[PDB]
Amino acid sequence: AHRKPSLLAHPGRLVKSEETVILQCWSDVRFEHFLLHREGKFKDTLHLIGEHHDGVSKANFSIGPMMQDLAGTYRCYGSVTHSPYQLSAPSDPLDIVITGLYEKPSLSAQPGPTVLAGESVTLSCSSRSSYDMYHLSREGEAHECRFSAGPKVNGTFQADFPLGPATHGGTYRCFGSFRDSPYEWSNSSDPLLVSVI
């Protein structure tokens, strides 16, 4: 049990539909072998060899055009040839999410895109579609605040995400999602520009 390798996903963790994604999995420690894996129903693990280009030891595990069922919790391992080399400790889990699959919500103005400092800017997500849950990206350089929506409230389906006290601004994206399929997200809502004057 050497030491969990890397497993970083670029150019994104959050992959679009039908497209490219290279799950790189390196370790400072030499690793003749690498193995990827995922907790999604319809799983697999790849036995790829490992390229040592530069004094590290990578493995560029390429996924195909992101089709639905490839989305899920990836996590590689590493080791040394021939008979079962037992693999090292599991790396830090990756959540590969396939987007572009459903309608783009609407990053709601209300309150409002241009607030004054220290006020309460609380974003939200409207959609006629039944997105059991929602998601919110970037806050100066952020990631995700994936939360559950409100019921069939006279048309829409919202998920008010409050940021209340505001000290900066930035762009945001809302991603519609269904319950029974957590990595299978929708399309991106037009990016919203919060800022502070």
Describe this structure in words.
The chain has 197 residues and is mainly beta. The chain has two domains: 98 residues, Sandwich (Immunoglobulin-like); 98 residues, Immunoglobulin-like. It has no helices and 13 strands. A three-stranded antiparallel sheet has the order 1-3-5, with no helix packed on it. Strand 11 and strand 12 form a beta hairpin. It is elongated, with a radius of gyration of 20 Å.
User: What is the top-level CATH class of the largest domain?
Assistant: Mainly Beta
The chain-level structural class is mainly beta
Q: Termini distance?
A: 53 Å
CATH architecture of the largest domain: Sandwich
CATH fold name of the largest domain: Immunoglobulin-like
Order of helices and strands: EEEEEEEEEEEEE
Q: How helix-rich are the residues, as a percent range?
A: under 10%
Q: Strand arrangement, largest sheet?
A: 1-3-5
Dominant shape: elongated
Count of strand segments: 13
User: What is the fourth-level CATH superfamily of the largest domain?
Assistant: Immunoglobulins
How many structurally independent domains?
Answer: 2
Radius of gyration from CA coordinates: 20 Å
Main sheet specs: 3 strands, antiparallel
The number of helices is: 0
Percent of residues in beta strands: 15-25%
